[PDB]
Amino acid sequence: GMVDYYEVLGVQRHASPEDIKKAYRKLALKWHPDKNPENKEEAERKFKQVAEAYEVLSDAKKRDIYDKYGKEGLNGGGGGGSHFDSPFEFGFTFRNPDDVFREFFGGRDPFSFDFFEDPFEDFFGNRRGPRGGMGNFKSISTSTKMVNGRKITTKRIVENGQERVEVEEDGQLKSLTINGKEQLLRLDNK
Numbered sequence: 159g160m161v162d163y164y165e166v167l168g169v170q171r172h173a174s175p176e177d178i179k180k181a182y183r184k185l186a187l188k189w190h191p192d193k194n195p196e197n198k199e200e201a202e203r204k205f206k207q208v209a210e211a212y213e214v215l216s217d218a219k220k221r222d223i224y225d226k227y228g229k230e231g232l233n234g235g236g237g238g239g240s241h242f243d244s245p246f247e248f249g250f251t252f253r254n255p256d257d258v259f260r261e262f263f264g265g266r267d268p269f270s271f272d273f274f275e276d277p278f279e280d281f282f283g284n285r286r287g288p289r290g291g292m293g294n295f296k297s298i299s300t301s302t303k304m305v306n307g308r309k310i311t312t313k314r315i316v317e318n319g320q321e322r323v324e325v326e327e328d329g330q331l332k333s334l335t336i337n338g339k340e341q342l343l344r345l346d347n348k
Contacts, residue, residue, distance in 0.1 A: 160229050163211035166204070171229060175216055182212040183268045186259060190267060192286060209255030219245045294318050 160171035167173070167181035187193060189205035214220050226242040227234025235244075259265050266286070267275070277287030288294050296316040303310050313324045325333040334341050 161215060161224055161231070163215040166207045166211040167215070178212065178216050182208060182216075186263060186268050192284070193267065206255035209258035210252070213253065213258055288318050291317070
């Protein structure tokens with residue numbers, strides 16, 4: 159009948175490889191972890207499914223199998239009674255969906271721009287930019303002590319060459335300094 163991966167892509171069984179590429183790219187954005195983190199439940203599940211769907215469905219070796227079977231799947235060739243040459247299952251494991259998207263996109267929004275959607279030009283940091291960026295951290299020094307029953311924690315965080323000191327008391331930020339310039343926390347109403 160049809161291959162379930164088509165339903166994952168949201169297309170018809172007669173969709174071309176190029177149309178598979180379309181759905182793949184579109185859904186890569188649509189259900190991207192950073193696109194819809196609010197519904198991470200539906201997003202994660204479908205996002206990962208898309209990885210599998212694309213990789214397998216787009217494989218000519220699997221298409222050969224599907225053509226033999228008639229898109230029947232379970233023992234399709236036997237049920238249909240077909241006689242075509244096809245590749246065999248050799249105990250192949252499942253691939254990390256994240257690695258799939260890493261290969262083809264880099265784990266990033268397919269429809270993003272390096273000149274317009276610059277991660278390092280984002281006040282809020284909703285483009286995988288600095289301020290919590292992986293590989294951007296040089297070194298973090300953490301030291302905690304007890305003062306009059308109070309938990310005093312000081313963190314020296316170096317990121318992108320910039321140093322910021324964070325001093326907390328019982329889990330509450332008391333002082334914050336950036337490159338020797340103390341910032342006023344009273345301005346932070348987030």
